[PDB]
PDB file of C-alpha atoms and ligand atoms in Angstrom:
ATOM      1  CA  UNK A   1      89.433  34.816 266.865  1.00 35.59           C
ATOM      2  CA  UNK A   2      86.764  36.448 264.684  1.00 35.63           C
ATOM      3  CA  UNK A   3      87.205  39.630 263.983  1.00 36.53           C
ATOM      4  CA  UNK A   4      85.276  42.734 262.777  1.00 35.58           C
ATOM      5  CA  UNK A   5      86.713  45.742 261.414  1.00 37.21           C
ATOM      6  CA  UNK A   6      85.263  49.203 261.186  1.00 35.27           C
ATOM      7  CA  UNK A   7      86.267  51.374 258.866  1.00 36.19           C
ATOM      8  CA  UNK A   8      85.350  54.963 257.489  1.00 33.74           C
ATOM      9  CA  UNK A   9      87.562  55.782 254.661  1.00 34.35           C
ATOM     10  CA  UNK A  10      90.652  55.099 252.649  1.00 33.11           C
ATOM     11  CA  UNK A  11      90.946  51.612 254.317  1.00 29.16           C
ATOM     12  CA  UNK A  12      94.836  50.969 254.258  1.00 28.80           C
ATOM     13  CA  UNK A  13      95.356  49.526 257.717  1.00 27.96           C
ATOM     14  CA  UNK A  14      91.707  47.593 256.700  1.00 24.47           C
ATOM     15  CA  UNK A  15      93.945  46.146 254.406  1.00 25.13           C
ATOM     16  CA  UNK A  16      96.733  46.029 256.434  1.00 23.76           C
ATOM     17  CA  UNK A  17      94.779  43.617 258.540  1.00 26.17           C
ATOM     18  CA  UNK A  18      93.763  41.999 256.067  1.00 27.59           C
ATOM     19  CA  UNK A  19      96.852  40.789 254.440  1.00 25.84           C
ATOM     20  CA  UNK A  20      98.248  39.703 257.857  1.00 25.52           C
ATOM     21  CA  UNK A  21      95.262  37.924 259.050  1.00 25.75           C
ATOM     22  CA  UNK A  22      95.480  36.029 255.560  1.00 26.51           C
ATOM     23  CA  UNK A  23      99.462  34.208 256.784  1.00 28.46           C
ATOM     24  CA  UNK A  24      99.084  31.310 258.067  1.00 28.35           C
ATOM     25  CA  UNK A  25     100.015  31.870 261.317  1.00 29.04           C
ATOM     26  CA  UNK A  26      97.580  34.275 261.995  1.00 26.81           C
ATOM     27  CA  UNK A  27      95.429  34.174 265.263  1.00 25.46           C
ATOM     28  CA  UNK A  28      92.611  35.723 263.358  1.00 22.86           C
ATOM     29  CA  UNK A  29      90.422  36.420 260.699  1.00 22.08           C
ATOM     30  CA  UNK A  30      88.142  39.074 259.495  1.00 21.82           C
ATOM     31  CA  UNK A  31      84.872  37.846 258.995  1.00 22.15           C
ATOM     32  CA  UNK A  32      83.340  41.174 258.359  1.00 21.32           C
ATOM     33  CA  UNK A  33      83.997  45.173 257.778  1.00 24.85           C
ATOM     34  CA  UNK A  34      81.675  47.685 258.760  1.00 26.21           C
ATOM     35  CA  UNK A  35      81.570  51.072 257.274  1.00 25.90           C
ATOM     36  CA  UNK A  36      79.257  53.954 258.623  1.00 27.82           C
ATOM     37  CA  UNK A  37      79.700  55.815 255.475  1.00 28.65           C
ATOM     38  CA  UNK A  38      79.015  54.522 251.794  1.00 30.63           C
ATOM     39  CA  UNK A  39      81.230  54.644 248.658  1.00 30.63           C
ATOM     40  CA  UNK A  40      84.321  54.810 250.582  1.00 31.13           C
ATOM     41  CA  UNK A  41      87.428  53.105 249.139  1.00 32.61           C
ATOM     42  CA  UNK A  42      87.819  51.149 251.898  1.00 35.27           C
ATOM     43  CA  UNK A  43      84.457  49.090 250.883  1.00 33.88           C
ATOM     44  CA  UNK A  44      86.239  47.938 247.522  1.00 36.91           C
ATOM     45  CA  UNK A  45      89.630  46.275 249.878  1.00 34.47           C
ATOM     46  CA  UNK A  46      86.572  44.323 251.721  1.00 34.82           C
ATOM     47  CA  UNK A  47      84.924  43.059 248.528  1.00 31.42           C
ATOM     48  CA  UNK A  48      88.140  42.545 247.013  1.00 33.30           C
ATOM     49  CA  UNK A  49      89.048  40.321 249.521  1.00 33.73           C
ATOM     50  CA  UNK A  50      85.759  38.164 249.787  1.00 34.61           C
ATOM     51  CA  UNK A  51      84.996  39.727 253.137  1.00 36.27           C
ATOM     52  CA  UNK A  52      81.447  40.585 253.929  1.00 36.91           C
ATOM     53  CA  UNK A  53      80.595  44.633 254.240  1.00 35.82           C
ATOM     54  CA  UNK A  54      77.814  46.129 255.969  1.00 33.34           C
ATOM     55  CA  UNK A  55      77.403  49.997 255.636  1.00 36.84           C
ATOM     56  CA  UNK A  56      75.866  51.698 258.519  1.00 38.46           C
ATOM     57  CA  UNK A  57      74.940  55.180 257.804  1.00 37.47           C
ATOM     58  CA  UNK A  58      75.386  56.704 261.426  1.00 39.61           C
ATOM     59  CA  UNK A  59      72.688  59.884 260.240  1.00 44.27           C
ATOM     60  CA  UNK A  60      69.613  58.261 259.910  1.00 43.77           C
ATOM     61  CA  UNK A  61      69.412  57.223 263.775  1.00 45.95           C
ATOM     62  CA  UNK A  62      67.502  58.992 266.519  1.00 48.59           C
ATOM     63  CA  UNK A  63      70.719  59.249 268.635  1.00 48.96           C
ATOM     64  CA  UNK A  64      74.255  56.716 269.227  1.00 49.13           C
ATOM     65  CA  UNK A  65      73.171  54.417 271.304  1.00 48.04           C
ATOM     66  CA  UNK A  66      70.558  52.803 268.660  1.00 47.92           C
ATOM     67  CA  UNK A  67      73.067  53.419 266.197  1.00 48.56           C
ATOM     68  CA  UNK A  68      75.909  51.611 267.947  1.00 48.00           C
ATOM     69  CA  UNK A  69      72.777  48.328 268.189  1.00 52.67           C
ATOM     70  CA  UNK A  70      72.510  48.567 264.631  1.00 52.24           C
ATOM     71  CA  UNK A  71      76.254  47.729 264.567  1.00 50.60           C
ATOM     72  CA  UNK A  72      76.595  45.491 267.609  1.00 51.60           C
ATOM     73  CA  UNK A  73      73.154  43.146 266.108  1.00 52.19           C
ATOM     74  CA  UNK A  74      75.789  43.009 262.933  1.00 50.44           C
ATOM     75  CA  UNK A  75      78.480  41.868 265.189  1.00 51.31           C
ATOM     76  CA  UNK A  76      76.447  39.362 267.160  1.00 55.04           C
ATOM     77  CA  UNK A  77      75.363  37.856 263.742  1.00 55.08           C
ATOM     78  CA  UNK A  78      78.879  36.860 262.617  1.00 54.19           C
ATOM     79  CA  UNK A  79      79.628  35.784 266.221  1.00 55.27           C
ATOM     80  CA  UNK A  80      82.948  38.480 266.203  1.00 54.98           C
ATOM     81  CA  UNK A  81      85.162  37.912 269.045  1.00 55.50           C
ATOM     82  CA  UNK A  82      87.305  41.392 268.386  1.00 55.48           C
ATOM     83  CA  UNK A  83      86.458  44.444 267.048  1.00 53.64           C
ATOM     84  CA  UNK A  84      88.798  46.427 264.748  1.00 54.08           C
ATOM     85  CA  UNK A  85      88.699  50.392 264.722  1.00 54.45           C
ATOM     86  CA  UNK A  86      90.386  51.126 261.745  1.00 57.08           C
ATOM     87  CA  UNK A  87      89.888  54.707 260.232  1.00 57.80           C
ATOM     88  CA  UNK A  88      86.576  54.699 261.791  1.00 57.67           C
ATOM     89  CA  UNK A  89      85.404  58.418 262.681  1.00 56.66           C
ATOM     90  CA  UNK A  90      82.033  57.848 265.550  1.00 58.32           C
ATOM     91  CA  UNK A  91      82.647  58.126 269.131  1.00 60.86           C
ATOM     92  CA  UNK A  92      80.644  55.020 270.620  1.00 57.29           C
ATOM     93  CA  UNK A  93      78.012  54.598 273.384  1.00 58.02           C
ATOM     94  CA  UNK A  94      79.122  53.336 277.283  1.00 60.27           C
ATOM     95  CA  UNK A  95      77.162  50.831 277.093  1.00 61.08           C
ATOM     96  CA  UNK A  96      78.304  49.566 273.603  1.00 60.47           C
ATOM     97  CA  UNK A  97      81.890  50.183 274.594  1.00 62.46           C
ATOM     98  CA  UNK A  98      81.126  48.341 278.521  1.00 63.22           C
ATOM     99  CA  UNK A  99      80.521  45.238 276.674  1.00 62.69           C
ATOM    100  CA  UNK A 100      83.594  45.456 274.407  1.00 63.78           C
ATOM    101  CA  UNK A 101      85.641  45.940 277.492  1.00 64.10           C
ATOM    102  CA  UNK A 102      89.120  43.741 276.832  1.00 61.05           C
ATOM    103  CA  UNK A 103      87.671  43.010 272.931  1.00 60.19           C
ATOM    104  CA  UNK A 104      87.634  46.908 271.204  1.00 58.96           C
ATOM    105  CA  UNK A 105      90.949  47.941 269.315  1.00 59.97           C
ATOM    106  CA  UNK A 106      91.885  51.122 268.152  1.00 61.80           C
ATOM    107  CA  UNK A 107      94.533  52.614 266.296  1.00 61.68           C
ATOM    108  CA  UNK A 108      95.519  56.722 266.944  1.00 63.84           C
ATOM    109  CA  UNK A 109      98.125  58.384 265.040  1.00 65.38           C
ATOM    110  CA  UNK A 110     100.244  59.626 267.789  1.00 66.82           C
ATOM    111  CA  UNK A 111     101.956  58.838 270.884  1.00 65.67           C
ATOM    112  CA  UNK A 112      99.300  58.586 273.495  1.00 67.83           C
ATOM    113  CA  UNK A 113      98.841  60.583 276.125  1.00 67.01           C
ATOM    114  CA  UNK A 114     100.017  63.475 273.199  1.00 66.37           C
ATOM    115  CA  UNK A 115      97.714  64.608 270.616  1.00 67.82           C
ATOM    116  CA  UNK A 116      94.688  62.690 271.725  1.00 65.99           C
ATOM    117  CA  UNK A 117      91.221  63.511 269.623  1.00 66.14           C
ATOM    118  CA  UNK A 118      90.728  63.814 265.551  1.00 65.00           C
ATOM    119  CA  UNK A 119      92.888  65.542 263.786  1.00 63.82           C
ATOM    120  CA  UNK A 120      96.022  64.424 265.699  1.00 64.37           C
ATOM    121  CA  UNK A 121      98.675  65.475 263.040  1.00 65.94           C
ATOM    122  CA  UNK A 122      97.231  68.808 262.735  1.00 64.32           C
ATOM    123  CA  UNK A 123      98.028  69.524 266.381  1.00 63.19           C
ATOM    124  CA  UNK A 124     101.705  67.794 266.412  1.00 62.78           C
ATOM    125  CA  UNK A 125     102.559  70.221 263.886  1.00 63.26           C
ATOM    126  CA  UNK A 126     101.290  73.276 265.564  1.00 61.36           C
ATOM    127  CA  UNK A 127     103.375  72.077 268.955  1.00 62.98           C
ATOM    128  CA  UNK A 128     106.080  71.558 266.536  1.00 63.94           C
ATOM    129  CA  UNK A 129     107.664  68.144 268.341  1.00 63.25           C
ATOM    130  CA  UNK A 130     110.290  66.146 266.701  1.00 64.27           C
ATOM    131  CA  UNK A 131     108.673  62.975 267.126  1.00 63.63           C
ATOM    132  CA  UNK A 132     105.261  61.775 266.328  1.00 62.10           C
ATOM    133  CA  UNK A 133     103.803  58.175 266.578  1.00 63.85           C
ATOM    134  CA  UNK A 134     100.782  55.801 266.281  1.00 65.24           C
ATOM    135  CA  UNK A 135      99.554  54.320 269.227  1.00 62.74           C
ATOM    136  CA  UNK A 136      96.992  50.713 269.504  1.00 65.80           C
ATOM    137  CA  UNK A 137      95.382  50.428 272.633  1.00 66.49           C
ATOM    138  CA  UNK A 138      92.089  48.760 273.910  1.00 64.52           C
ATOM    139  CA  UNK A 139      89.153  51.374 273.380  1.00 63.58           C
ATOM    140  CA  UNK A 140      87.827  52.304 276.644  1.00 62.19           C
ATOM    141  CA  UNK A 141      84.815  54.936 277.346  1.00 66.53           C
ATOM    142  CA  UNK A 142      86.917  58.018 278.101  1.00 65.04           C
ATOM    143  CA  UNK A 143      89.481  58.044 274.991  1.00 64.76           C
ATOM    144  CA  UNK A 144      92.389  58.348 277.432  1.00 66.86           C
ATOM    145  CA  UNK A 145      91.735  55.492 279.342  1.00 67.70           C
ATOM    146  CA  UNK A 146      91.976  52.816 277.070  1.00 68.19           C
ATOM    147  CA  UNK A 147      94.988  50.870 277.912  1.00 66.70           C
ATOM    148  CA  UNK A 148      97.992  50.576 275.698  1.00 68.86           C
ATOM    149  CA  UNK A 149      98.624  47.777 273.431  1.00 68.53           C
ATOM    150  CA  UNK A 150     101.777  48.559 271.227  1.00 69.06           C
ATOM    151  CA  UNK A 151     103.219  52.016 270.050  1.00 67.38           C
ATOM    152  CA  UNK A 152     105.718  53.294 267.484  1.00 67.46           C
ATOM    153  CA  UNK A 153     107.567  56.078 266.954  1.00 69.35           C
ATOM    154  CA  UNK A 154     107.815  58.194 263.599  1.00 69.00           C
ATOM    155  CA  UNK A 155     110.008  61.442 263.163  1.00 71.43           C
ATOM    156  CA  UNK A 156     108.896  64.503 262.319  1.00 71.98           C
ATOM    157  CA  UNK A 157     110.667  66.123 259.286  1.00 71.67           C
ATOM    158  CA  UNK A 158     111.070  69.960 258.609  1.00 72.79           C
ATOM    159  CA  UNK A 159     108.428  71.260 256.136  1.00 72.74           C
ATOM    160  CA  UNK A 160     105.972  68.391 256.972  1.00 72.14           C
ATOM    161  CA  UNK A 161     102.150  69.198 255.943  1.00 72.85           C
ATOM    162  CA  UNK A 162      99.631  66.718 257.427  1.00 71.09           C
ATOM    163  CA  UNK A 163      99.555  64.903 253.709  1.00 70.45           C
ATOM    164  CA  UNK A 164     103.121  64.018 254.446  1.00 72.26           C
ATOM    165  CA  UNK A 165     103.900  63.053 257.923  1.00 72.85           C
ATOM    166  CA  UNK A 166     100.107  61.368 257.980  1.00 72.58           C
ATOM    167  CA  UNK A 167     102.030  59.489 255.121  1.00 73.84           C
ATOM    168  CA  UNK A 168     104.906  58.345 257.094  1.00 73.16           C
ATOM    169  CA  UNK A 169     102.842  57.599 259.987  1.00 72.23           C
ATOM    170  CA  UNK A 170     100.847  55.365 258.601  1.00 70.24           C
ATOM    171  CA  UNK A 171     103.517  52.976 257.646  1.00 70.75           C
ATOM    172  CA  UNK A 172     103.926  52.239 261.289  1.00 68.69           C
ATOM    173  CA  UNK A 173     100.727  51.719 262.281  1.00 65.62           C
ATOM    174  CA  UNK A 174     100.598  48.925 259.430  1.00 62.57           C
ATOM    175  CA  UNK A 175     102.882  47.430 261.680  1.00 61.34           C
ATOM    176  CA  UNK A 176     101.675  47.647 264.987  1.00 62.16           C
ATOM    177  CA  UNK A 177      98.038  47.547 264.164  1.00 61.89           C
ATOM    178  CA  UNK A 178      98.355  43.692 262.616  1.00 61.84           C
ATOM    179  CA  UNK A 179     100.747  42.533 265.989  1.00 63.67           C
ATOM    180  CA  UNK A 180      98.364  44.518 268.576  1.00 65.73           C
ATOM    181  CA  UNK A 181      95.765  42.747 267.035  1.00 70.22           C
ATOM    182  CA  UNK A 182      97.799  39.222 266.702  1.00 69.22           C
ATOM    183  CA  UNK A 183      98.866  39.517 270.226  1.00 69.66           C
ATOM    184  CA  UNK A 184      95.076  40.396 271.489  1.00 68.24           C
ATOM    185  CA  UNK A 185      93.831  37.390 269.200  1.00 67.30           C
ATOM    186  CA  UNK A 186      96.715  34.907 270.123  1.00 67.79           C
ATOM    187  CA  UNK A 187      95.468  35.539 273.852  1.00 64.62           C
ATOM    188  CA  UNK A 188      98.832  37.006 274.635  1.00 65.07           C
ATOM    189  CA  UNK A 189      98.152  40.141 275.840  1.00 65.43           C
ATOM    190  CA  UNK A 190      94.970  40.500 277.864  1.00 63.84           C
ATOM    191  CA  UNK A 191      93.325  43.573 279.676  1.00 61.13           C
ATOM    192  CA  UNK A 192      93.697  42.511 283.412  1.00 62.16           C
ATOM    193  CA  UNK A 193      91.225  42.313 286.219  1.00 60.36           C
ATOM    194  CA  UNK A 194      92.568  45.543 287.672  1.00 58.84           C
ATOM    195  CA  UNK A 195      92.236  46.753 284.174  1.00 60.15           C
ATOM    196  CA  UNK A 196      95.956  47.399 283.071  1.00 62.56           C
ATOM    197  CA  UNK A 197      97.607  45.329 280.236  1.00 64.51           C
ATOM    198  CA  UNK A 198      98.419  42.124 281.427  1.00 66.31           C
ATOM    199  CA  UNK A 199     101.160  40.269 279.179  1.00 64.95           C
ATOM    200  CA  UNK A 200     101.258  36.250 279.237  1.00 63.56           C
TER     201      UNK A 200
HETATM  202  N1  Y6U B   1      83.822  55.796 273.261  1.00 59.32           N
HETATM  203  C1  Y6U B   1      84.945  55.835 272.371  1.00 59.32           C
HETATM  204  N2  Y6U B   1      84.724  55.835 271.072  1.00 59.32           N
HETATM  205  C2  Y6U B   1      85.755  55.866 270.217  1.00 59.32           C
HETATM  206  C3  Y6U B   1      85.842  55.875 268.815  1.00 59.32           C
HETATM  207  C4  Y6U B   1      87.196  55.921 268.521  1.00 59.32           C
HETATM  208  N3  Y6U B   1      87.893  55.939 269.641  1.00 59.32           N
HETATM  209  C5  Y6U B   1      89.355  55.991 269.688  1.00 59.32           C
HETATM  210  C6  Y6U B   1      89.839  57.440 269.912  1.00 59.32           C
HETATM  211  C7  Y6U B   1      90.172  58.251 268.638  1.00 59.32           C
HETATM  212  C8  Y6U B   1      89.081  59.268 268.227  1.00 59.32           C
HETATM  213  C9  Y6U B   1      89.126  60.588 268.651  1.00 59.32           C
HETATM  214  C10 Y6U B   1      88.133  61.473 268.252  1.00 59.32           C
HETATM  215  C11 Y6U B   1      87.111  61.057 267.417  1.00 59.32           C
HETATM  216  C12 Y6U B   1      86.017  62.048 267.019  1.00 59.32           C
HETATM  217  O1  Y6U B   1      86.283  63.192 266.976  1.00 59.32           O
HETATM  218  N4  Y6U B   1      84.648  61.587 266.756  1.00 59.32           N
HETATM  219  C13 Y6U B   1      83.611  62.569 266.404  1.00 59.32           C
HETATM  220  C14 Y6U B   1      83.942  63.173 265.042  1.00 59.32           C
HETATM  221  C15 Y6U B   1      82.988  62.697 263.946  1.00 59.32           C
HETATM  222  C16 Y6U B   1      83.169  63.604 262.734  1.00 59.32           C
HETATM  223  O2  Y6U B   1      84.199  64.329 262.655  1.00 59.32           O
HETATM  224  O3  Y6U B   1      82.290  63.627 261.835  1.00 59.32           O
HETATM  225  C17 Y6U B   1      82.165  62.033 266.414  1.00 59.32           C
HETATM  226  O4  Y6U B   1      81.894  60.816 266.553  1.00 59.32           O
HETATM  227  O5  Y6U B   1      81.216  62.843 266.291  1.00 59.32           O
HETATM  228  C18 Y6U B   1      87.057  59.753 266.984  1.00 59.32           C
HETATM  229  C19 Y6U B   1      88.041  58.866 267.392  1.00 59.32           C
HETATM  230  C20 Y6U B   1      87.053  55.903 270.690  1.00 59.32           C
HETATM  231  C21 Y6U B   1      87.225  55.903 272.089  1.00 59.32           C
HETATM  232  O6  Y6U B   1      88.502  55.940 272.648  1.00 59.32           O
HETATM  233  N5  Y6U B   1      86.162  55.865 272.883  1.00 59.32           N
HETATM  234  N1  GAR B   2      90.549  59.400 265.185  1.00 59.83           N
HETATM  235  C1  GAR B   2      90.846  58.148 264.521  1.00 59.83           C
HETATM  236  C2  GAR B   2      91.809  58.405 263.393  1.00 59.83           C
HETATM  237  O1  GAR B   2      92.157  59.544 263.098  1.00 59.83           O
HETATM  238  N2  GAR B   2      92.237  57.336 262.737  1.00 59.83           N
HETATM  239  C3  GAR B   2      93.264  57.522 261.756  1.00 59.83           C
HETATM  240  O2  GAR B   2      92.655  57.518 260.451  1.00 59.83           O
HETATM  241  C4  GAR B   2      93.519  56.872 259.495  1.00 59.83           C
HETATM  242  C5  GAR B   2      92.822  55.709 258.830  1.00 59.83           C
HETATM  243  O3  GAR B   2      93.292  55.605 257.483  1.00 59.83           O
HETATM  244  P1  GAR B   2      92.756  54.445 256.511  1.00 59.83           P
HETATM  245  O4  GAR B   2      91.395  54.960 256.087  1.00 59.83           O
HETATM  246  O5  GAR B   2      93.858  54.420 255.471  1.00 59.83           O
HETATM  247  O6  GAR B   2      92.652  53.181 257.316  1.00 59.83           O
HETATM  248  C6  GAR B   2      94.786  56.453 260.257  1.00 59.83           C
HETATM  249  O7  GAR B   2      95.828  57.383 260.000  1.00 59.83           O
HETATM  250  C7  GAR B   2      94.373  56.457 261.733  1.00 59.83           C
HETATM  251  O8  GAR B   2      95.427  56.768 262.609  1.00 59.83           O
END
């Protein structure tokens, strides 16, 4: 399946994708990355790579939904089956997320339903829980009904500041991020007519 990730920073799941979709058993490849925001570090994996980068500066449209065209003429032009949110920071149009029903991936760091919105790890440390997560699931319009793809859990150590437990965090969802996607891609998970996972 051809995929097309979106990034908006640091780009370490981008990568994280891309060294899984590079084994040979992989169910897909990255034909292009698409960043909203220029001279990010995440542009730099994508070249490095020989992967195709578009940058899409979200602040020079009238409002999203010609933005999100913008990106969805991109995706149409390198025919991309599956769309990878990976670090990327723009809440999408209905209409541009209607027609990525089933194909739209994100990954959240935290255990969905908790902690849903931006700054996730800011709010997990406020509660004060013991365990934190990262959570894949298919990007829906409202951000909490997207169904759930794969999740992982990550403790919570005392003294944690976001630059830490982000840190730990994020080695998880370099795990579930490349199988959520490789189980989309493989067509082994599928979102179902009624519009729950359906496993295969
Ligand atoms: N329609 C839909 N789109 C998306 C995009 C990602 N996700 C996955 C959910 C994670 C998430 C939660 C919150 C924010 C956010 O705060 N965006 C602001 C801030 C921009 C800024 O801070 O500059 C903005 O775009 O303005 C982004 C992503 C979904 C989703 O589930 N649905
Ligand atoms: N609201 C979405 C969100 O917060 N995404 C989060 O941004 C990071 C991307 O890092 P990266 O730039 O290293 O890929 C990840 O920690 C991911 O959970």
């Amino acid at each position: 399946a051809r995929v097309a990730v979106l990034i908006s920073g640091t780009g370490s799941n981008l990568q994280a994708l891309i060294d899984s979709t590079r084994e040979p058993n992989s169910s897909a490849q990255i034909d292009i990355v698409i960043s909203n925001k220029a001279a990010v570090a995440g542009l730099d994996k994508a070249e490095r790579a020989g992967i195709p980068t578009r940058v899409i500066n979200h602040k020079l449209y009238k409002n999203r939904v010609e933005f999100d065209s913008a990106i969805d003429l991109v995706l149409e032009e390198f025919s991309i089956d599956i769309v990878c949110l990976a670090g990327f920071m723009r809440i999408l149009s209905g209409p541009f997320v209607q027609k990525w029903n089933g194909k739209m991936l994100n990954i959240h760091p935290s255990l969905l339903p908790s902690f849903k919105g931006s700054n996730a790890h800011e709010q997990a440390l406020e509660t004060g829980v013991t365990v934190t997560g990262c959570t894949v699931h298919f990007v829906a319009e409202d951000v909490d009904a997207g169904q759930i793809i794969l999740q992982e859990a990550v403790p919570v150590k005392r003294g944690d500041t976001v630059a830490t437990l982000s840190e730990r965090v994020k080695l998880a969802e370099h795990k579930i991020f490349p199988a959520a996607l490789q189980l989309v891609a493989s067509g082994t998970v599928q979102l179902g007519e009624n519009g729950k996972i359906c496993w295969v």
